[PDB]
Every structure is written in C-alpha cells, then in structure tokens.
Amino acid sequence: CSYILNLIPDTPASYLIHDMAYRYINLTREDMINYYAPRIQFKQTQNV
C-alpha cells in the first residue's frame, strides 16, 4: 500500500487500485487485528 500510494493512476482499474490501497492504509488497529485473526478469535467490527 505504501508503494501504491506513490504512483499516479491513469486508467479506471488503476484508480480503483489506488482507492482500495488507500482504504487499506486507513484501517484502524482493531480492524487490522480482526482482519488477520482466525474466526475463533474474530469479532465483528465496523469495517472488517
């Protein structure tokens, strides 16, 4: 995501690429913890 945020999109697919990388980089710590957590410990959050 850090690498993607440097580039400048030129095509709609590239624009979606940039938007999704931005959305990933803008996720809260609890969201990131539950994002990589197994379903046994997984808890519902606002984004993940």
Place this chain on the structure above:
Amino acid sequence: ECFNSNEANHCQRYPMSRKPRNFLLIQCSLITSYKPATTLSDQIDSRRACSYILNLIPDTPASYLIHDMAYRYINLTREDMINYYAPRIQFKQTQNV
C-alpha cells in the same frame, strides 16, 4: 599541572553527570549529491516519506506522534493537497489546510 589542577577543581565544584547532552541541532544524513528542493520535489518527497514512515513501528511518544502526523498527511483530500502547496494568491480556505 595547571590544567590538571583546574580539572580537579572543576570536578569538585560541579555535580557530575553521565549523559552528555545534545549538540547537533539538526541531525541528518546524505549518501549522494543534493539537489535544491522545489515545491514539486517537496510534494513527491513528502508522499514517499509518509509511505516510509507508515512501515515502521513507533517505540517512544515522539515516534508515536511522528507516525500519527504522517498518517494525517497521507489522509488528506486532493483539494486539501492542492491548497497545501499553493501560493496565497490562489490559496482558498479548506477544512484541513
């Protein structure tokens, strides 16, 4: 002899300390030539620098503030970034900048 005697007197007069305080007011490093910074290069370098900062894990409160401010910079809207680097002649008030 005078230097040694005055060293002894100086050590007697003041309390000792074990932490030599800072002198380098701006710590920095270079490996290559330096090109004078322009506004376009400033924008590019700020983007790359925030990307580099977002990879690290802070350990101290100053590092935590560093990470928070880099995150806030990377989370600025396009109009905000345009007005951030714009001269006051074309500058217009926004929500963040």
